[PDB]
């Protein structure tokens, strides 16, 4: 059948929201009131990948764009991306595992860790207006935790 997908945002856990910020750029900033239709809506697929309880493979796609988080290696490490794909062809079930992060659910939050590289996980800085990462610990002063929220 066809891919299912939810809309929905993220906050890391100390309550910063995702925003686009250049070209192919994902930056974590506080936000509250009107600046918040600022925020990046995902839609997070639910897509093919080994899977448990409390692990679960997503893609990451920004929505109604031919966008999609992925993780490739740059200057030979593991980078967080924005890439895009054809639209005819996204989403779908089979996504190649550049796209597929383990959505993990620890203590009323989530992590987001790469397939492609394990235990390099979506994180973000405790400074304002800095990039969204990959992150090469889910220990330390880097954010790796999250929350959802959904939307219509
Ligand atoms: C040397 C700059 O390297 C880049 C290039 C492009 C964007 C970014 C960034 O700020 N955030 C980002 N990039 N993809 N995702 C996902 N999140 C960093």
Redesign the pocket.
């Known amino acids: 059948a066809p891919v299912r997908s939810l809309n929905c945002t993220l906050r890391d856990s100390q309550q910063k929201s995702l925003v686009m910020?250049?070209?192919?750029?994902?930056?974590a900033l506080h936000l509250q009131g009107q600046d918040m239709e600022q925020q990046v809506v995902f839609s997070m697929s639910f897509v093919q990948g080994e899977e448990s309880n409390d692990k679960i493979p997503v893609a990451l796609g920004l929505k109604e764009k031919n966008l999609y988080?992925?993780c490739v290696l740059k200057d030979d490490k593991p980078?967080?991306?924005?890439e895009s794909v054809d639209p005819k062809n996204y989403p779908k079930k089979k996504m190649e595992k550049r796209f597929v992060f383990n959505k993990i659910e620890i203590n009323n939050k989530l992590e987001f860790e790469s397939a492609q590289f394990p235990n390099w996980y979506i994180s973000t800085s405790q400074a304002e207006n800095?990039?969204?990462?990959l992150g090469g610990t889910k220990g330390g002063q880097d954010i790796t935790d999250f929350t959802m929220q959904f939307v219509s």
């Open positions: 910020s250049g070209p192919y750029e994902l930056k988080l992925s980078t967080l991306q924005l800095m990039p969204v990462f």
